[PDB]
Design a binder for this molecule. Structure first.
Ligand SMILES: Nc1ncnc2c1ncn2[C@@H]1O[C@H](COP(=O)(O)OP(=O)(O)O)[C@@H](O)[C@H]1O
Ligand SMILES: Nc1ncnc2c1ncn2[C@@H]1O[C@H](COP(=O)(O)OP(=O)(O)O)[C@@H](O)[C@H]1O
Ligand code: VO4
Ligand code: VO4
Ligand SMILES: [Mg+2]
Ligand SMILES: [Mg+2]
Length: 1170
């Protein structure tokens, strides 16, 4: 797959960032290059066997001075390490923030066309969360460490050039093997990272889709299906990670083996050179040490190379989206700002085909007139051309032919910000963001004070219900207003449209939930403030548009007639056809628990720990062999030094092969155990989340995008923390223990002193680990909040485009992201200071060791040879282990991630889905009853939506539940399919409490349809076959025929295979509701918890659907709710009043014959509207 070049990642750095990166590079270079020249100086005393050992008095003074020089080097390294760590971390944090802001701005600028063809909310959330973290890790202090290692290697090579050239020619000719291995490693890791990212992106979308529509998932029991799909979506990542781990082990082993063969050859040539006499001791010592340190540094920098590979792999995907230029805008040509705006929309021979289905022609030579100040109404069939006109007007899609005129010029030539402001669009189904009511209203005009908002709310008949809420204007509505009533949602959208005060009003299929009285109030408000402005009304019910001057019906291709009410009746046209159709229808200690959780694959962990320890041995063995080599060199051994050198080069060859084997084994087995653990924890976390009740979802921090981001982020660190920390910790402790034992072997008093210094280093590391942890937790929540904001913005692009609100989203993003920069500055400064202090403490320890050894030499025993061998071994081992401190921060940032993982698993649901023993009874009766049920929603537990009321539905009957003011129409449905718990009383379905019956059987025996159906992002056939899984295509076809859906479905090109899209877009409300009814009838439950169904079906299909529903409910119990008072002819148990309490139900015919009542007044008002 394609990958962005590494240098292209630095595309968001200003002058200040360039200076910081330059300072960091200089500091890293100095830190790397300090050591080789320092040991070049150190060689003068390393030659002590022939330099000044004759006079014992001068040895102690000389080595004390050299200890002071080593302390000076410690100060120099401490100062240098501070600069390169702090400057690089600050530069990385600044760049990623600008990248995130630019990416959000670029993705929020794309039109609706880009989102429907290849874009998903889950994909966007995952790209925001994970990829930006990888890019931040790519350009962080990892580059500093890589530059430090490279500078050390080059400095060692230059030092080798100075003393004796041939040795350094070998050390420079061995480069191509390491280069080729690194190239293969980078290429393979980039490929594997691309594949794994693709695999993970699909998994994240599936989980979030199931989480968002939790009510539909619970109603049509499908947690097993979602879990199986999620597990299958991450099947390939196991093999890809296995290959990546095998590649990592092979590269490091090959590098170390090449280094070992180079060391053996360089030792043999150095020996023969000393035999020649051209070289003398110290030069060979310096060259050998330089070569060893260079090979070690390359082996260390291999991991940073891999990190860079992954970073560039993610950076390609991030950069590809932002660089995508938007669709056509082309608006400023002549009419930049016309002051003669009056409406007068002209449509001339305009054709249109949607990008998803370009073959189907929606419009063919479409002509229509929208004169100024005239309330033009649009009516037609269920899905012909109604909402497409609004989409064309609101610059969503251009027409492939023809043009449309805003009374002075084609709309293609305008100003986009100017155009969208003059027209106020009302969505067919409003999409309220997750923000308080007042700010939702302020979406329209952000510069409106309280008085204007109050006036707008009062105009739209929304003051009453808003002021009755506990908080008032600050109550949250949650995701898409799921926790707010359907009727109250429409009032908020109307108020938001009114506050904008546009010159052209586009009333789409709104004003549907308002039963009779709110309808009259909003119509009075509309034709009292919108008089004198261009008006376009798209209404299904014919009574609302009775007082319309010109009713232009829209059918296939073009319009038919543009007459008034009475004029179209005379010819009977096609408008009067709808009228006569309507008339006849009416008649702590959790890390150990996490390791315990990985019990089944214990052999892999054991063998990996064996490999880690075994590679831990080889660290100090190099120093031991080098010390013995220099000892025999200074003896000059002109008897059997040939034998000594050949035996030791054989040792080197064996050690190289040994290291290859050990590294391969260790890395492969840790890779496999880490991937198994990550997959298992992901599966269990998703199962635990799906186990929770709906109330846990109805909160502020429990959002679909938030949960998806948390799942995507946490497990990843859970891998990276477990895989990396375990390897380095075991290796470093094993190497340190081996070096300490070796120090014990040659000396005892000196080594006790060095083991007396470990508390200082461990306390410094503990301080490091403590300091960074506290502020790391705060930033995680902020990043999750930003991801949630981005996902919420992307999910409602239709509302964002209509009401220009990109500035608000950017402002919220910046406000959320402001704090982490300020915290990161101090975090970087503290980390750099602590790293410098740790390095200074580490170096100061060795100087004291050398001084103590010198003092012992002055006193007698433990002479020159023993102390300096200890010094060299400690130097090598400390240099080898001086990587855990650098690796500590990025590992320790996942500590709070693990705590979040266990917090989700720990929580026990209040609603146990099965309980595994709770009366598995399948013989359902259907005689539901309520007894003194008192309920209050957990979100606002101060409203008491239900009073002491009781209602009974005998099996074989039906409910009407007229709900004029939203009190309990949809709340009773939540009781039967229990989502919450009644505070008092009890509810029974089969004569027994449903709290003790297992939910799986009950939810299998019962089925419902939502008031606002939300189709899954799949084909029509998959959506229909969601209920009663394992259904042949014949059954699906029969269900679609019975639901009056085979008509339009067969009209579609790809039969029952056309993709729908997220939330159920790229279709019509009528078609979506038909598909939902088809799924519900396919499930075929004993009790059909029906609800408001004749919402978007007010067309020529109304008679067919109602008859089919009546036939379906012949042997079923239904609770259908309907404020339309037209499709409730089933005269059983209407249930007139549900305002908190209940009122005597009787029957529909009874209350028709009974005197004035809530149903009677509703019918009177509807007939008056008629
Ligand atoms: N975003 C879209 N992508 C592809 N096809 C669409 C899209 N929106 C609407 N359509 C198609 O256009 C037709 C009419 O849709 P719509 O305007 O919603 O009808 P109505 O508004 O009368 O219900 C539908 O059959 C649907 O298949
Ligand atoms: N999930 C929820 N969280 C908080 N309040 C809710 C929730 N669902 C409904 N309500 C409140 O209960 C009242 C009645 O809602 P609802 O049952 O939808 O009425 P209807 O079904 O008659 O439209 C509303 O005013 C709403 O504020
Ligand atoms: O907002 V409702 O149509 O459930 O009364
Ligand atoms: O816009 V609709 O004709 O699916 O109510
Ligand atoms: Mg529509
Ligand atoms: Mg409702």
């Amino acid at each position: 797959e394609q990958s962005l070049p590494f240098f292209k990642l630095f595309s968001f750095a200003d002058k200040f960032d360039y200076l910081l990166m330059f300072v960091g590079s200089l500091g890293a270079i100095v830190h790397g290059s300090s050591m080789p020249v320092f040991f070049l100086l150190f060689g003068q005393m390393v030659n002590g066997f022939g330099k000044n050992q004759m006079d014992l008095h001068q040895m102690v003074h000389e080595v004390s001075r050299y200890s002071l020089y080593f302390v000076y080097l410690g100060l120099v390294v401490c100062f240098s390490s501070y600069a390169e760590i702090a400057c690089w971390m600050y530069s990385g944090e600044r760049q990623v923030a600008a990248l995130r802001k630019k990416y959000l701005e670029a993705v929020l600028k794309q039109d609706v066309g880009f989102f429907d063809t290849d874009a998903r909310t889950g994909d966007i959330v995952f790209s925001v969360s994970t990829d930006t973290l990888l890019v931040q890790d790519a350009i962080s202090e990892k580059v500093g460490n890589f530059i430090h290692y490279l500078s050390t290697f080059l400095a060692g090579l230059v030092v080798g050039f100075v003393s004796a050239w041939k040795l350094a020619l070998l050390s420079v000719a061995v480069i191509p093997g390491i280069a080729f291995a690194g190239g293969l490693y980078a290429y393979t890791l980039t490929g594997i990272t691309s594949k794994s990212r693709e695999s993970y992106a699909n998994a994240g979308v599936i989980a979030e889709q199931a989480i968002a529509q939790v009510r539909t998932v619970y109603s049509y029991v499908g947690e097993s299906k979602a879990l199986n799909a999620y597990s299958d979506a991450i099947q390939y990542t196991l093999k890809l990670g296995y290959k990546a781990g095998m590649a990592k082990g092979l590269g490091l082993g090959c590098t170390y083996g090449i280094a070992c063969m180079s060391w053996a050859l360089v030792f043999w040539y150095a020996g023969v050179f000393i035999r020649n006499g051209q070289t003398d001791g110290g030069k060979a010592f310096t060259a050998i040490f330089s070569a060893i340190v260079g090979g070690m540094s390359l082996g260390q920098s291999f991991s940073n190379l891999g990190a860079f590979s992954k970073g560039k792999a993610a950076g390609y995907k991030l950069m590809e989206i932002i660089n995508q230029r938007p669709t056509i805008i082309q608006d400023p040509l002549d009419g930049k700002c016309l002051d003669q705006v009056h409406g007068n929309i002209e449509f001339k021979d305009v054709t249109f085909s949607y990008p998803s289905r370009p073959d189907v022609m929606i419009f063919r030579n479409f002509n229509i007139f929208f004169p100024s100040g005239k309330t033009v109404a649009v009516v037609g069939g269920s899905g012909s051309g109604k909402s497409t006109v609004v989409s064309l007007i609101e610059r969503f899609y251009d027409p492939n032919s023809g043009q449309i005129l805003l009374d002075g010029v084609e709309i293609k030539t305008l100003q986009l910000k100017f155009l969208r402001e003059q027209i106020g669009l009302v969505n067919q189904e409003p999409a309220l963001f997750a923000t308080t009511i007042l700010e939702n209203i302020l979406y329209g005009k952000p510069d409106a004070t309280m008085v204007e908002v109050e006036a707008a709310a009062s105009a739209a008949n929304a003051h009453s219900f808003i002021t009755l809420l506990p908080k008032g204007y600050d109550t949250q509505v949650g995701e898409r207003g799921v926790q707010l009533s359907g009727g109250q949602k429409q009032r908020i959208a109307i108020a938001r449209a009114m506050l904008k005060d546009p010159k052209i009003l586009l009333l789409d299929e709104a004003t549907s939930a308002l039963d009779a009285s709110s309808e009259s109030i909003v119509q009075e408000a509309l034709d009292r403030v919108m008089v004198g402005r261009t008006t376009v009304v798209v209404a299904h019910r014919l009574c609302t548009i009775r007082n319309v001057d010109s009713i232009a019906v829209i059918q296939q291709g073009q319009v038919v007639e543009t007459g008034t009410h009475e004029e179209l009746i005379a010819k009977s046209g096609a408008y009067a056809s709808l009228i006569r159709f309507q008339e006849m229808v009416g008649t702590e200690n959790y890390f150990y628990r996490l390791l315990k959780l990985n019990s089944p694959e214990w052999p892999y962990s054991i063998m990996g720990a064996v490999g880690s320890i075994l590679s831990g041995f080889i660290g100090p063995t190099f120093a031991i062999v080098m010390s013995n080599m220099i000892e025999v060199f200074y003896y000059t051994d002109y008897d059997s030094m040939e034998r000594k050198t050949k035996e030791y080069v054989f040792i080197y060859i064996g050690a190289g092969l040994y290291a290859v084997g050990a590294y391969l084994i260790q890395h492969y087995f840790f890779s496999i155990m880490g991937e198994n653990l990550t997959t298992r924890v992901r599966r269990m976390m998703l199962s635990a989340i799906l186990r929770n009740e709906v109330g846990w979802f109805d909160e502020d921090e429990h959002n679909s995008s938030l949960i998806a981001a948390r799942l995507a982020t946490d497990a990843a660190d859970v891998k990276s923390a477990i895989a990396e920390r375990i390897s380095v910790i075991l290796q470093n402790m094993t190497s340190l223990l081996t070096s300490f034992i070796v120090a014990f072997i040659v000396e005892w008093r000196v080594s006790l002193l060095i083991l007396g210094t470990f508390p200082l280093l461990v306390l410094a590391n503990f301080a490091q680990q403590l300091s960074l942890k506290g502020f790391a937790g705060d930033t995680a929540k902020a990043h999750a909040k930003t991801s949630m904001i981005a996902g919420e913005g992307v999910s409602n692009i239709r509302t964002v485009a209509a009401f220009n609100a990109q500035s608000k989203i950017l402002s919220l993003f910046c406000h959320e992201l402001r704090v982490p920069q300020k915290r990161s500055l101090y975090r970087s400064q503290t980390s750099g200071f602590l790293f410098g202090l740790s390095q200074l403490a580490l170096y100061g320890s060795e100087a004291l060791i050398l001084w103590y050894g010198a003092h012992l030499v002055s006193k007698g025993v433990s002479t020159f040879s023993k102390v300096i061998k200890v010094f060299v071994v400690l130097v090598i081992t400390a240099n080898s282990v001086a990587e855990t401190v650098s690796l500590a921060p990025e590992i320790i940032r996942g500590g709070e991630a693990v705590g979040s993982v266990f917090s989700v698993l720990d929580r026990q649901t209040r609603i146990d889905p099965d309980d595994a023993d709770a009366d598995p009874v399948e013989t359902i009766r259907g005689d539901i009853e309520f007894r003194h049920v008192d309920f209050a929603y957990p979100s606002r537990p101060d409203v008491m939506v239900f009073r002491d009321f009781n209602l009974r539905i005998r099996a074989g009957h039906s409910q009407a539940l007229v709900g004029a003011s939203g009190s309990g129409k949809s709340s009773v449905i939540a009781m039967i399919e229990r989502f919450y718990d009644p505070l008092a009383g009890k509810v029974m379905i089969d004569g027994k409490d449903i709290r003790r019956l297992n939910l799986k059987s009950l939810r299998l025996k019962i089925g419902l349809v939502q008031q606002e159906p939300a189709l899954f992002a799949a084909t029509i056939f998959d959506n229909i076959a969601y209920g009663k899984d394992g259904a042949t295509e014949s059954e699906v076809i029969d269900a679609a025929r019975a639901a009056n859906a085979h008509g339009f479905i067969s009209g579609l090109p790809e039969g029952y295979k056309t993709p729908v899209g997220e939330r159920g877009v790229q279709l019509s409300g009528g078609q979506k509701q038909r598909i939902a009814i088809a799924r519900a009838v396919l499930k075929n439950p004993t009790v059909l918890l029906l609800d408001e169904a004749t919402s978007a079906l007010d067309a020529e299909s109304e008679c067919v659907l109602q008859e089919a529903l009546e036939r379906l409910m012949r042997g079923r119990t239904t609770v259908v709710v309907a404020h339309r008072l037209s499709t409730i002819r089933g005269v059983d148990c209407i249930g007139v009043i549900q305002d908190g309490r209940i009122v005597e139900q009787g029957s529909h015919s009874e209350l028709v014959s009974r005197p004035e009542g809530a149903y009677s007044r509703l019918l009177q008002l509807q007939t008056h509207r008629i």
